[PDB]
Structures are given as C-alpha cells and as structure tokens.
C-alpha cells in the first residue's frame, strides 16, 4: 500500500525526480490537519459496532427479501458473513482515512470483490446500500462539533466520503 507521502515518492522515482516544493506544500497541508484526521479515525472507529449494526438493520428493513428464507442473508452463517463484510469495509475505509490514501482499501478489500459476489450470488447493489448507510453515519459522528476543539473539517469529510463512495462503486 501507499500512504499519502509514499504515493508522491513512487510517482517521483519513476521520473527520477525530487519531490517538488509544490508537492511538499500539499503534504504540509495534510500534516497541519493531522489532529483532525486522527479525531475522525478515532470517532468512526469508536462507533464501529453501532455503525455496522444500525446500517445492517436499516438495510434488511428496506430489503426484506435479503433475510427471507432462501435470501442471501438468510441462515446464521450467511447473516454473520454479511455483518462481517460490512465491518470489513468500514475497517478498510478507516485505514484509508488514517493513511490519506486509497491504496489499502483498493488493494486488500475492493480488488475482485464484485466478482466474488457475482460467483456467490450476493447482490452487490444491496451491499452498496449498506456501505452508503455506514458512510452517512460515519461522517455524522466524525463531524459532530460537540466534544472537540472547534474548527473546520470540511476537506477531511469530503475525503472520507470519497473512500466510502469508492467502496460502494466497486460493488454497485
């Protein structure tokens, strides 16, 4: 995987180039927002169980066919695998937030997921819905002004949302 810093370096090496004063400024920006970034990671993580459970409950309520006998989420083993997948995606998304780069999420989580679900007969559109519900709940908790020094986290939230969207689009 790459973090934000390593991504720049790898694109520089293939050019035999030094990191530009420009790219340095962009990395300096990320560093300046570093504490906000870790607050977001801590907050989403500290609510991981509820985020998954609440998103799954809502999903099954909107799509009762998923849990009716014969449905993909029917039986304990399948229900548990479903909940596990939700937790997995949330986990890899937080890795991407922490690292400031999507490679971890794409490489170790999204790669081949669509095709896996195809082979199993798991409905990807439904997974994408579950992922979007986690996204909204996660940003909501991350961006709550209560209990944190006041300041603007808008760019971070837009970045957080892009990682969730990438996950959803990978299986939609």
């Amino acid at each position: 995987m790459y973090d934000a810093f390593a991504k720049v370096v790898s694109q520089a090496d293939s050019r035999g180039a030094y990191i530009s004063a420009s790219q340095i400024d962009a990395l300096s920006a990320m560093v300046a927002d570093g504490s906000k970034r870790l607050d977001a990671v801590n907050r989403i993580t500290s609510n991981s169980s509820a985020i998954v459970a609440n998103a799954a409950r809502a999903l099954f309520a909107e799509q009762p066919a998923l849990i009716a006998p014969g449905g993909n989420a029917y039986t304990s083993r399948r229900m548990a695998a479903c909940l596990r997948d939700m937790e997995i995606v949330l986990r890899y998304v937080t890795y991407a937030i922490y690292s400031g780069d999507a490679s971890i999420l794409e490489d170790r989580c999204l790669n081949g997921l669509k095709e896996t679900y195809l082979a199993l007969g798991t409905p990807g559109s439904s997974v994408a819905v579950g992922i979007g519900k986690m996204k909204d709940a996660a940003i909501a908790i991350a961006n709550d002004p209560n209990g944190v020094t006041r300041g603007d986290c808008s760019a971070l939230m837009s970045e957080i949302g892009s990682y969730f969207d990438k996950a959803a689009a990978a299986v939609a």
């Binding site: 973090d3 370096v9 990191i19 340095i24 560093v31 922490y98």
Partner: protein
C-alpha cells in the same frame, strides 16, 4: 512501501483489528517528524547537484586510483565520472524520499535491495560509496532534527554497504 503509517496499518490489518490509540500515537510521531523531514528533503534537493559533484570529487581524492586505472568500473573516462556522479545523485535522492515518508522504505525498495549484486557484478567498491556518503553528511548544511533524520538514512546506507 514501508512508512510509519503503512506499518501501523499493516500491523493492525494482520490482526484483523481496527486502529486504536496505539496507531494514533504512531501518526502523531509521524506528524511531529514530518515538518523537519520535509524541510530536509527540500534543502537537499536544492543542493543535490553540488553535493553529488562534491562527493564524487571527495571519492576521487580519497581513492585516486579510481581516476587512473583503466576499466569500465572506474572513473578514468568521462563516461565513468558521469556514472559515478549519477550514482551518488541516486543516493542523495533516496535520502530525500526517506525524509518525505519518514523511513528507510524508499531507499530499500529502490536502492538497497539488490545493491550487493550490482556491486559484485560490475566490480564497484562499497567503500567508494561510503566515502561519498560521508561527504554528503559533512556538507548538506542541515541542522537540528532535519540533520539527525537525514543522517539516519545516510548512516543506514553506510551500514548496508559495510
């Protein structure tokens, strides 16, 4: 590639864990380091050509036979001199990349892994490069944490060569 952040993520992932305050500390340490790290990378890149040329001359001066003996592995031809300053430039650039990510990762991935095979095959002495690297240390004009960090990566390369 390895950095303090990707190593934290990797450790967590291998354990199937969410990140915790453990990895938060890693990141604060990274962010604490990065300002002086980036400054080092900036200054070094600005002095890179001067440093590489200076270091090559330091090598020729420590080991004069390197500019006298014939052979493709030596700097007795213009082609050889050019190879040599190029190589030292590679080392310097790698040091900057380490300063950018806060670890040896880039130097390992791009330079150190396989360096042994290259020097054996092309009959280049590690001591030449150790002398070059010592010149860079004595001349980058860095100070404070920027210096301690850049020197750490330079000394890392020296260790790998010795």
């Amino acid at each position: 590639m390895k950095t303090p952040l990707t190593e934290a993520v990797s450790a967590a992932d291998s354990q199937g864990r969410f990140l915790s305050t453990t990895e938060t500390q890693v990141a604060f340490g990274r962010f604490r380091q990065a300002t002086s790290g980036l400054a080092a990378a900036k200054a070094l890149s600005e002095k890179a050509e001067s440093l590489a040329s200076g270091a090559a001359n330091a090598v020729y001066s420590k080991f004069p036979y390197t500019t006298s003996m014939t052979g493709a592995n030596y700097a007795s031809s213009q082609t050889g001199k050019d190879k040599c300053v190029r190589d030292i430039g590679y080392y310097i650039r790698m040091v900057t990349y380490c300063c950018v990510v806060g670890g040896t990762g880039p130097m390992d991935d791009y330079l150190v892994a396989g360096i042994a095979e290259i020097n054996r095959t092309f009959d280049l002495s590690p001591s030449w490069y150790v002398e070059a690297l010592k010149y860079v240390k004595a001349n980058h004009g860095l100070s404070g944490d920027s210096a301690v960090e850049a020197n750490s990566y330079i000394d890392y390369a020296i260790n790998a060569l010795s």
